């Protein structure tokens, strides 16, 4: 909000914030509509204070009350405070934009994708006797993904049934300017 | 009754809570700071984590909000176990309980006064563990317990049970007074004290 | 009844003979919850427990969370080197096939016969020579957050029952990749609970 | 130093200049095309 | 050790001791070790069903409050009859124990 | 040989080989056996096949 | 004014009990983030409370004096300034919706319509 | 004088009966821990099976009370055996049915209490002897209405 740095020169700079995943953490096993709800609310309280500032751009993630395969759609119209109707009118969207898992972003031309880190964290779910947890052997992982024009290498570990028909949409076809996991 | 029931649970659950917590009457590994323990709590309060003390205060908060009807003071007791001798003494004021909405201003005075009674607890020294016990004293308006089992009380639900239960747990009885802030508003006009030596 | 062989043996054996449990056609459930009964009168007297479990028992029978291994006949079918149990299934409200449970558009799990006349002889048989019957125990037996809640606990479920159910068929396929689900897709061992947990995991995702 | 000479070498060099409060600074403009223009790729139903 | 007092009289001694109590008290007609009978940890699960079995009365109770009968004094169980009278400005206190520091203690080193 | 000395119900290959062996085999129907030996691509399945007859094999020792 | 802002910070600190921040009293005097630091400053000269101040060093960091006697890096601040006042020792905020219709130091470039 | 008699003498023999089950003095497994109740009290009361004990008891505490008004304290000592020392020394003695009711059931209460809280002491070691009339000392409550108001104490070592 420009309020710590006190420097409005720098931090206007910063057009929206994007909130790649993880932003609600709970054991699936044992939980109640209680926690959830106090969680959601207590989000949408800083989404309140955070909106008519600066953009945001909300993602799921694999601990996210949402889907656990890798297409996620996003969350729902609920599961949010009932002041932030205003915003869920459908005609302010560049303000707060709800999308799916995976997205290619042309911010003003320049093609960034984000995805929920799902996949590489699947890839590295398994322990393979050859190849000889660092930063090195993540950032490799992440570039034989971009090499290999596949974003999920492990089929039915992180992909779930009917993904597309003749198709395949993880397949890549163009080559994005920046990649964001 | 409506909705006054449940937030005088909750209060008295947060009550109870802080006053285990912070007189170390308990190992405070035991506690976890949360803010749902079945009830929606206006702050990050240490609960414990232990079925037995769990049901033993949701019973006695239980019996205490049965019995409100004629309970105009509730007090919590912490004494001695080599001496059965009262050390603390912190006093909750039910002064005709304005009996027969904005849950968030509810919330928020019980948040004040659990900010308030924390604030008192930390000035207090440390106290040490092995058998620094705590007991439960309750004061009445007109009422008598441990007489309703004269006619056997043939029983054939739950409700009588556990009304039975109540009526016979109890067992009649017989300095730095620090007042402190209680709830100010409309259906919850709740008062607090403190004593000590 | 508990046996100490030695005075310095400090656990009970439970050593039966003759048990209810000795019978041709059987079901596994009605073994397990004698041996539970049983277990709880030995160690704590406590008939209200055993209500309690019973009464659990005949609820969650009634509703239909059981694993459906325990409450299947097991016919024997020449064909003397017979080896082949075909399993019964509850009825028809008959003798379906596990594969009616499988394409499980319905259920017609009943509190009925089957339930009647395999838990209630044994347990009265027993509980007659305490003093207390069983047959009235059971007599008295007779929003979005949530469902998304649901839907994500049976999605992991189901996920769990692949991943499982996968790095078993890998005994035999040695891979990991793609095919080996499909491979792992075709066990119908009868003889693992696994496979009708998965089968009923699908059937309530496709329904 | 202390936490104390900090606070008084700072606190009471503010400038307290440019907070008008009437005439704040716009955010940069930035617009993802992709927000309405066709083909959402990971759209399932 | 503990003097008695400055004025004092003494009764007659026990009849039985640690050990010959149970043997007297098996000679009496009873048994040695009267061990724990089938019964109802709940008054409500009683619902009258010792009743009797194959013409067999069953003698099956509770441990309840409710269920316990009073004591006796020379075969006499006393009991209150008159109605109570509640007095104003009264005070109680709360009678079960509460657990110990010890046991929450090694119920949290044990990691469950 | 394993109904005179062992007392269990199925009697079959697996059962006897996961309450004797500690081992759980997984079992296929034979029309997914010959589907798999009569593919022409997919080793896959040719080495699922012959596993699986080894592994029935060996546990019969 | 350094007498309305006293009075209010000491009522939102003694009579109801609450930890005090400057956003608070930003959005009361609608004033600025400089000048509400000033007089958070000037409240914290001329005690019952415990003072909670944060610092700005470079690259962009932003860290929370805990011990107040090993700041590290004193000669790369930029910044240091008072962020709240909590009587007690847990800090534990709590947070509400605001109505920020003149107090906002940066707008968006979009309106809501 | 009617209610306080038979209270009196229910309460004192439920009181002889814990500090003869409590302690050593007797084996366990004699008493009826699941069967009687006292006062209404939550608590377990155990009272022995054995008839000749109980009417020794009975028959002392009728003696006791025949002539309560000579005496002014009733006192059940603790004999140590082999040594003859007194280890533990629990004395006692110096309206509405109710009020010498709960006075009996708060007397009982704190004796329960205070009895549980007690170490454990090996068998066969303890005898005890009723007498009519370094030092850890402890206070009861007592009953207060009636003008016959009885103290409660207990000494140790
Ligand atoms: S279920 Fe079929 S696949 Fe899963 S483990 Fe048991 S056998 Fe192997």
């Given at each position: 909000?420009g ?38 609310t ?20 694999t ?9 996620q ?24 934009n ?11 031309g ?30 490799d ?11 999920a ?29 | ?9 909750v ?5 109870i ?41 949701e019973?006695?908060i ?89 006619r ?46 | ?37 049983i ?10 427990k ?69 838990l ?8 007659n ?79 | ?7 008084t ?25 992709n ?11 | ?31 040695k ?59 109680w206190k ?19 | ?30 029309e ?30 | 004014m ?60 932003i860290?929370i ?18 962020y ?30």
């Open positions: 909000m309020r710590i740095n006190n420097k409005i020169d720098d931090i206007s700079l910063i057009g929206r914030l994007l909130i790649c995943g993880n932003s609600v953490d709970f054991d699936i096993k044992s939980v109640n509509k209680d926690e959830l709800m106090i969680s959601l207590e989000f949408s309280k800083f989404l309140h204070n955070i909106l008519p500032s600066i953009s945001v751009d909300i993602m799921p993630g601990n996210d009350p949402s889907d656990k395969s890798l297409p759609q996003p969350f729902h119209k609920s599961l949010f405070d009932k002041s932030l109707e205003s915003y869920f009118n459908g005609s302010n969207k560049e303000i707060l709800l999308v799916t898992n995976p997205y290619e972003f042309s911010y003003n320049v093609d960034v994708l984000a995805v929920s880190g799902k996949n590489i964290n699947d890839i590295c779910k398994y322990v393979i006797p050859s190849n000889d947890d660092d930063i090195e052997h993540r950032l992982l992440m570039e034989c993904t971009m090499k290999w024009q596949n974003i290498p492990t089929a039915p570990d992180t992909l779930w049934c009917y993904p597309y028909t003749d198709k395949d949409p993880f397949v890549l076809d163009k080559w994005p300017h920046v990649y964001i996991v | 009754n409506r909705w006054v029931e449940k937030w005088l649970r209060y008295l659950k947060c009550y809570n802080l006053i285990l917590f912070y007189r170390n009457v308990y190992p405070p590994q035991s506690f976890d700071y949360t803010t749902y323990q079945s009830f929606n709590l206006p702050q990050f309060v240490p609960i414990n984590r232990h079925p037995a003390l769990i049901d033993y205060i019973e006695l239980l019996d205490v909000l049965s019995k409100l009807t004629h309970v105009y003071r509730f007090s919590i007791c912490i004494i001695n176990k080599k001496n059965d001798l009262c050390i603390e003494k912190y006093v909750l004021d039910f002064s005709e309980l304005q009996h027969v909405i904005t849950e968030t201003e509810v919330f928020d005075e019980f948040r004040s006064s659990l900010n308030s009674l924390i604030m008192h607890l930390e000035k207090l020294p440390k106290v040490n563990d092995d058998t620094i016990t705590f007991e439960a004293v309750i004061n009445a308006i007109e009422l008598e317990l441990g007489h309703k089992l004269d056997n009380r043939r029983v054939d639900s739950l409700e009588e049970k556990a009304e039975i239960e109540r009526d016979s747990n109890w067992v009649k009885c017989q300095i730095k007074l620090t007042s402190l802030v209680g709830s100010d508003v409309g259906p919850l006009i709740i008062h607090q004290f403190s004593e000590k030596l | 009844g508990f046996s100490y062989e030695s005075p310095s043996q400090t656990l009970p054996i439970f050593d039966a003979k003759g048990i209810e449990t000795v019978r041709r056609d059987g079901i596994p459930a009605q073994q397990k919850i004698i041996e539970k009964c277990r709880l009168l030995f160690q704590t007297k406590d008939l209200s055993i209500k309690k479990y019973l009464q659990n028992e005949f609820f969650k029978i009634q509703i239909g969370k059981v694993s459906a291994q325990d409450f299947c006949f097991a016919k024997e079918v020449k064909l003397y080197k017979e080896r082949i149990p075909y399993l019964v299934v509850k009825g028809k409200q008959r003798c379906v096939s596990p594969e009616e449970f499988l394409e499980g558009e319905n259920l017609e799990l009943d509190s009925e016969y089957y339930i009647n006349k395999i209630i002889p044994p347990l009265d048989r027993l509980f020579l305490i003093g207390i019957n069983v047959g009235n125990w059971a007599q008295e037996i007779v929003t979005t957050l949530s469902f998304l809640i649901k839907k994500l606990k049976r999605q992991k479920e189901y996920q769990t029952l692949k991943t499982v159910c996968r790095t078993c068929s890998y005994r035999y396929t040695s891979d990991a990749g793609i095919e080996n689900d499909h491979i792992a897709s075709k066990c119908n061992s009868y003889d693992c609970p696994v496979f009708y947990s998965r089968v009923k995991a699908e059937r309530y995702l496709r329904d | 130093l202390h936490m104390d000479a900090l606070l070498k700072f606190n009471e060099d503010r400038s307290l200049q440019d907070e008008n409060l009437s005439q704040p600074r716009t955010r940069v403009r930035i617009v993802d095309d927000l309405y223009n066709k083909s959402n790729p990971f759209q399932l139903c | 050790g503990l003097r008695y007092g400055k004025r004092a009289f003494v009764y007659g001694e026990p009849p039985f001791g640690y050990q010959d109590i149970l043997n007297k008290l098996e000679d009496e007609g009873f048994p070790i009267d061990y724990k009978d089938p019964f109802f940890s709940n008054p409500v699960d009683l619902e009258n069903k010792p009743y009797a079995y194959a013409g067999k009365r069953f003698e099956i109770s509770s441990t309840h409050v409710s269920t316990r009968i009073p004591v006796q004094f020379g075969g006499e169980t006393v009991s209150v009859y008159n109605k109570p009278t509640f007095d104003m400005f009264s005070s709360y009678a079960l124990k509460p657990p110990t520091y010890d046991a929450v203690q090694k119920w949290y080193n044990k990691v469950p | 040989a394993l109904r005179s000395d062992v007392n269990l119900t199925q009697y079959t290959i697996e059962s006897a080989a996961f309450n004797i062996l500690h081992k759980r085999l997984p079992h296929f129907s034979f997914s056996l010959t589907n798999m030996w009569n593919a022409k691509k997919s080793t896959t399945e040719l080495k699922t096949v012959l596993n699986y007859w080894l592994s029935r094999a060996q546990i019969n020792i | 350094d007498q309305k802002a006293s009075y209010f910070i000491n009522e939102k600190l003694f009579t109801e009990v609450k930890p005090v921040l400057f956003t608070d009293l930003i959005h009361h005097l609608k004033i600025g983030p400089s000048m509400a630091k000033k007089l958070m400053f000037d409240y914290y000269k001329q005690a019952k409370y415990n003072c909670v101040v944060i610092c700005c060093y470079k690259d962009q960091t860290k004096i805990h011990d107040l006697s090993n700041i590290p890096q004193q000669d790369s601040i930029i910044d240091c300034f008072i709240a006042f909590n009587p007690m020792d847990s800090f534990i905020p709590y947070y509400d919706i605001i109505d920020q219709k003149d107090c906002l130091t940066i707008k968006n470039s979009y309106e809501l319509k």
